[PDB]
């Protein structure tokens, strides 16, 4: 199937409580494989997946150096944004960055990403063309002008089409046992009478990997998109995910509802109903 690699970074200032806290994590699909935390006992980039442990000391030193340099650039950038937004130096602010790449089943680049947010709002993003920028406001336009002058988009495109795709391909091969295994959902429907004339039907999906999944309820073969309660997909802690979808149905009409499950670990979408 298709795969992604992402690096996430968060800096949080805390005036009067020291310097900003910096945390960065790396993922292949929904598997965490590396972490760096400025406030750890001995901040170094640490392996979080068995398949990355084989990387040599030169890899770990290069990654640690990059994490430390990014923590520093974020401290500088938090100061810059206080100026660009005419803000007091007294409040706590957040800077987030994500970058990475998506590849298809043949390992070719599907899309590259590089984007930043300030206080949880979009700041500046590299467009899908890997050549132009979306600046959210006139402050981010100042960064856009500097980045256009410095040919930043060209440097990012080179990384995203090159090292990002090739190292993603390397990790997929080294972790093929897990990264290239899809665990289908284990599914069932529960029934909860609500009144004398209604009942809840809840369609459960457990133990699946990757997280992407589609649970839908149909009534007489028609999607119940606007009447379905869909909980956010949630991690179980054993690498797998869980999700449920629920509908409020008139008592006696249960067999007219079918739950449809789509997941990459399933060869065909599944259909299930309350089996009383």
């Amino acid at each position: 199937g298709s795969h992604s690699m992402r690096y996430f970074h968060t800096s949080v200032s805390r005036p009067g409580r020291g310097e900003p806290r910096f945390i960065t994590v790396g993922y292949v699909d929904d598997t965490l494989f590396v972490r760096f935390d400025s406030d750890a006992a001995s901040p170094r980039e640490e392996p979080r997946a068995p398949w990355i442990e084989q990387e040599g000391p030169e890899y770990w030193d290069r990654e640690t150096q990059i994490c430390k340099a990014k923590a520093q650039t974020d401290r500088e950038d938090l100061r810059t944004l206080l100026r660009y937004y005419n803000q007091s130096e007294a409040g706590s602010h957040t800077l987030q960055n994500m970058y990475g790449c998506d590849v298809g089943p043949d390992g070719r680049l599907l899309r590259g990403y590089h984007q930043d947010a300030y206080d949880g709002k979009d700041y500046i993003a590299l467009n899908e063309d890997l050549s132009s920028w979306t600046a959210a406001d006139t402050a981010a336009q100042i960064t856009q002008r500097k980045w256009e002058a410095a040919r930043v988009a060209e440097q990012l495109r080179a990384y995203l089409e090159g090292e990002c795709v090739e190292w993603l391909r390397r990790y997929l091969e080294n972790g093929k046992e897990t990264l290239q295994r899809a665990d289908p959902p284990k599914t069932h429907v529960t029934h909860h009478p609500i009144s004398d004339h209604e009942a809840t039907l809840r369609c459960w999906a457990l133990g699946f990997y990757p997280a992407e999944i589609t649970l839908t309820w149909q009534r007489d073969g028609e999607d119940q998109t606007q009447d379905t309660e869909l909980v956010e997909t949630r991690p179980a802690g054993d690498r797998t995910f869980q999700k449920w979808a629920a509908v409020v149905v008139p008592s006696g009409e249960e067999q007219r509802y079918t739950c449809h499950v789509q997941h990459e670990g399933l060869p065909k979408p599944l259909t299930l109903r309350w089996e009383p």
Binding site: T73, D77, Q155, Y159
Partner: peptide, 9 residues
């Protein structure tokens, strides 16, 4: 593998 490039706002 992370991008080694450093860019400031």
């Amino acid at each position: 593998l992370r991008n080694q490039s450093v860019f400031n706002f």
